[PDB]
Every structure is written in C-alpha cells, then in structure tokens.
Curated annotation (Swiss-Prot):
Pfam families: Macro. Its EC number is 3.2.2.-. InterPro entries: Macro_dom, Macro_dom-like. It comes from Archaeoglobus fulgidus (strain ATCC 49558 / DSM 4304 / JCM 9628 / NBRC 100126 / VC-16). The lineage of its organism: Archaea, Methanobacteriati, Methanobacteriota, Archaeoglobi, Archaeoglobales. This is ADP-ribose glycohydrolase AF_1521.
Length: 192
C-alpha cells in the first residue's frame, strides 16, 4: 500500500494511494457494487472474498442487508447499503459501504456524472450519519462500467469538496493498478 498524495480538504485529510482497498487503514471501505449487490467481479469480488472468505456468501449477506435497509432487491445511485467487514474487522475495517455507480460504457454526460457524484457522496454522508471518521473509496465505475478514470477522479474530488460533515476526518481514494494510479495522481495535483 503506497500513499501517493495527501492534502487537506476543508477539515478533512484527503489521501490518494495505490493498492488493495481491502488492506487500507480505514474504518469503512466503499464497494463499487452493481444495483443488485451481486459481487461477481472487480473490487466487489475482492471485497466480498476478503470479508467473508467466499464472495458468494457476502453476496447473500449484502442482499439481506439491502432488503432490510430498503425493502427491495436493488438500490439506486446515492443509496448506501451497510454490511459488517467481518474478516476485515481485525484489520480495523469495521464496515463496507456498498454504493452503485453508473454504467458509462465509454460515454460521458451530465446525467452519468450526476449519478457517479451521488454514488460518491452517498457513502460520505453515510459515514457522517454513522460517526465513522475514516473512509476509503475505490474508483467507482472506472472498471467494468467503463467511465473515464480521469472523469471518475474529478467527480470523486467534487464530492469530497462539496461534502459537509464533522465526523469524517479522513478520506482516501485507493487505486489498484500503477498505470491508473499515476493518472489519478495527475488529477489530484492539478485539482489541488
Ligand atoms: N482489490 C481492489 N482494491 C482497490 N481497487 C480495486 C480492486 N480490484 C479492482 N479495483 C479497481 O476498482 C475499479 C472499479 O472497477 P469494478 O470493480 O469492475 O467496478 P465498476 O463496476 O464500478 O467499474 C477499477 O478501476 C478496478 O481496477
Ligand atoms: Mg445506470
């Protein structure tokens, strides 16, 4: 796990790091899940596997929590389903905030952007609402959902800046591959 950047955003300490989010020193980690919380691949799989030891198991636990927290088998952009980090609790990660970003498929518009923004802000406010002081995010929609990485990071930062809370003291963006990390770093530098 390598921290590539660290700046102050309001009263929050924002960090950019390269590595596996399931190993980040945060109380809550965000999962870039699909509307059904079916963790079949991407970071969702990694997180599901690291929490329950078996992705299929966490997929079921997530569906239950969602049904319990919303009354349906799906969530909308902005809505966050909370589930215990289980096996990750011994690392300091207590919860997993499940959020759903848009499916860009290589496109970009104000509509897609607004959905990704909600997908990023939702977890922050959920962290505020719960009193969690530290939270780490993955590059929501930058993988399978094909949203431009640079656009993703810009949107993530816009959310972090517009966010208004007192409990959240630390926020991080964790990027898996080095190539993408450098791209994210450039955005962080020119935005701050
Ligand atoms: N273990 C992991 N930790 C942090 N980021 C990860 C991990 N595995 C994948 N990622 C990154 O998370 C981003 C989200 O992609 P993906 O998981 O398919 O979800 P989405 O459907 O939102 O695109 C990608 O940029 C991917 O490289
Ligand atoms: Mg959509």
């Amino acid at each position: 796990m390598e921290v590539l950047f660290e700046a102050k955003v309001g009263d929050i300490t924002l960090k950019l790091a390269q590595g596996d989010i399931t190993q980040y020193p945060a109380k809550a980690i965000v999962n870039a899940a699909n509307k059904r919380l079916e963790h079949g691949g991407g970071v969702a799989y990694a997180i599901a596997k690291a929490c329950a030891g078996d992705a299929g198991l966490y997929t079921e636990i997530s569906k239950k929590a969602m049904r319990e927290q919303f009354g349906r088998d799906y969530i909308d952009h902005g809505e966050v389903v909370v589930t215990p980090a289980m096996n990750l609790e011994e690392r300091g990660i207590k919860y997993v905030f499940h959020t759903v970003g848009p499916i860009c498929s290589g496109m970009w518009s104000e509509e897609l952007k607004e959905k990704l923004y909600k997908a990023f802000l939702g977890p922050l406010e959920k962290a505020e609402e719960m009193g969690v002081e530290s939270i780490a995010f993955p590059a929501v929609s930058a993988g399978i959902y094909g949203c431009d990485l640079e656009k993703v990071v810009e949107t993530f930062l816009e959310a972090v800046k517009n966010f208004k809370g007192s409990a959240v003291k630390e926020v991080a963006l964790v990027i898996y591959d080095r190539k993408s990390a450098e791209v994210a770093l450039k955005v962080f530098e020119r935005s701050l």
